[PDB]
Design an enzyme around this catalytic site. Structure first.
Site, PDB file in Angstrom:
ATOM      1  N   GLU A  11       0.685  -1.353   0.013  1.00 56.03           N
ATOM      2  CA  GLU A  11      -0.063   0.165   0.038  1.00 56.03           C
ATOM      3  C   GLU A  11       0.883   1.256  -0.021  1.00 56.03           C
ATOM      4  O   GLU A  11       0.314   2.248  -0.352  1.00 56.03           O
ATOM      5  CB  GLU A  11      -0.949   0.160   1.333  1.00 56.03           C
ATOM      6  CG  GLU A  11      -2.061  -1.008   1.129  1.00 56.03           C
ATOM      7  CD  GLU A  11      -2.971  -0.951   0.231  1.00 56.03           C
ATOM      8  OE1 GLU A  11      -3.102   0.021  -0.367  1.00 56.03           O
ATOM      9  OE2 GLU A  11      -3.679  -1.945   0.069  1.00 56.03           O
ATOM     10  N   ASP A  20      -6.088   6.392  -4.902  1.00 58.01           N
ATOM     11  CA  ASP A  20      -5.527   5.001  -4.937  1.00 58.01           C
ATOM     12  C   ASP A  20      -5.714   4.600  -6.413  1.00 58.01           C
ATOM     13  O   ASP A  20      -6.087   5.277  -7.257  1.00 58.01           O
ATOM     14  CB  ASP A  20      -6.327   4.005  -3.882  1.00 58.01           C
ATOM     15  CG  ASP A  20      -7.800   3.721  -4.317  1.00 58.01           C
ATOM     16  OD1 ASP A  20      -8.284   4.281  -5.503  1.00 58.01           O
ATOM     17  OD2 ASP A  20      -8.587   3.265  -3.484  1.00 58.01           O
ATOM     18  N   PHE A 104      -8.203  -6.451   3.209  1.00 57.22           N
ATOM     19  CA  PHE A 104      -7.879  -5.105   3.357  1.00 57.22           C
ATOM     20  C   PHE A 104      -8.136  -4.179   1.809  1.00 57.22           C
ATOM     21  O   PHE A 104      -8.704  -3.040   1.888  1.00 57.22           O
ATOM     22  CB  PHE A 104      -6.202  -5.000   3.685  1.00 57.22           C
ATOM     23  CG  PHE A 104      -5.944  -3.601   4.013  1.00 57.22           C
ATOM     24  CD1 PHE A 104      -5.739  -2.769   3.134  1.00 57.22           C
ATOM     25  CD2 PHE A 104      -5.728  -3.355   5.426  1.00 57.22           C
ATOM     26  CE1 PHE A 104      -4.984  -1.468   3.335  1.00 57.22           C
ATOM     27  CE2 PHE A 104      -5.292  -2.015   5.769  1.00 57.22           C
ATOM     28  CZ  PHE A 104      -4.981  -1.094   4.588  1.00 57.22           C
ATOM     29  N   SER A 117     -12.588 -20.041  -5.499  1.00 56.29           N
ATOM     30  CA  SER A 117     -11.046 -19.712  -4.946  1.00 56.29           C
ATOM     31  C   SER A 117     -11.057 -20.271  -3.332  1.00 56.29           C
ATOM     32  O   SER A 117     -10.049 -20.972  -2.878  1.00 56.29           O
ATOM     33  CB  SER A 117     -10.677 -18.390  -5.023  1.00 56.29           C
ATOM     34  OG  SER A 117     -10.726 -17.971  -6.520  1.00 56.29           O
ATOM     35  N   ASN A 132      -6.767 -20.070 -10.048  1.00 54.90           N
ATOM     36  CA  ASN A 132      -8.165 -19.576 -10.046  1.00 54.90           C
ATOM     37  C   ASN A 132      -8.273 -18.083  -9.830  1.00 54.90           C
ATOM     38  O   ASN A 132      -9.101 -17.485 -10.035  1.00 54.90           O
ATOM     39  CB  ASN A 132      -9.280 -20.500  -9.175  1.00 54.90           C
ATOM     40  CG  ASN A 132     -10.492 -19.971  -9.363  1.00 54.90           C
ATOM     41  OD1 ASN A 132     -10.857 -19.133  -8.355  1.00 54.90           O
ATOM     42  ND2 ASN A 132     -11.515 -20.638 -10.136  1.00 54.90           N
TER      43      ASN A 132
HETATM   44 CL    CL Z   1      -9.624 -22.240 -12.036  1.00 56.47          CL
HETATM   45  K     K Z   2      -1.940   2.667  -1.897  1.00 54.38           K
END
Ligand code: CL
Ligand code: K
Ligand code: V1A
Ligand code: CL
Ligand code: CL
Length: 164
Positions: A11, A20, A104, A117, A132
């Site tokens: 980040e 962002d 996050f 997933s 995936n």
């Molecule tokens: Cl997959």
């Molecule tokens: K950032």
């Protein structure tokens, strides 16, 4: 390495309001202020979050305070979510950090929607889960960060953050 060092790498740290990667007003270590296009709305959120009139600038200590709250909030969101908590509980601490990182960045509900997933992670089918996870808007829009997070899920090591 740990979740704080990991997210600090992903980040960055900026002490003035910035946009962002989605164009949203943000400050500190990826502290999202608002999705509103209004800078005044973002400044109001910032002053509320810090508890003083900041005029859009904060200190490093203030950034780290918000960051600790935000990491805490991501973990709390995982633990209160019926889809994320079983996966989290099933993981080792390194892969837990990878899940916290995703929450996050995209929020609890967003990650909880990664149903296939999550199942592959619960099954500890690490290469399949990694494959995936890359079939996603997330991977296409932030591929270098997604590759780091996915490598962490695939290997259970910190190798993708080592030389960073
Ligand atoms: Cl997959
Ligand atoms: K950032
Ligand atoms: S995506 C994907 N799944 C398997 C493990 C078959 N792969 O080798 C890729 C191409 C990385
Ligand atoms: Cl197990
Ligand atoms: Cl896709």
């Amino acid at each position: 390495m740990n979740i704080f060092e990991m997210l600090r790498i992903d980040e960055g740290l900026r002490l003035k309001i910035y946009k962002d990667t989605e164009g949203y007003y943000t400050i500190g270590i990826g502290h999202l202020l608002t999705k509103s296009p209004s800078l005044n709305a973002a400044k109001s959120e910032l002053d509320k979050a810090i508890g003083r009139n900041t005029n859009g600038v904060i200190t490093k200590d203030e950034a780290e305070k918000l960051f600790n709250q935000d990491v805490d909030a991501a973990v709390r969101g995982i633990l209160r979510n019926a889809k994320l908590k079983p996966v989290y509980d099933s993981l080792d601490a390194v892969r837990r950090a990878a899940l916290i990182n995703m929450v996050f960045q995209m929020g609890e509900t967003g990650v909880a929607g990664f149903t296939n997933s999550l199942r592959m992670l619960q099954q500890k089918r690490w290469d399949e889960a990694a494959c995936n996870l890359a079939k996603s808007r997330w991977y296409n829009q932030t591929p270098n960060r997604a590759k780091r997070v996915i490598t962490t899920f695939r290997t259970g090591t910190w190798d993708a953050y080592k030389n960073l």
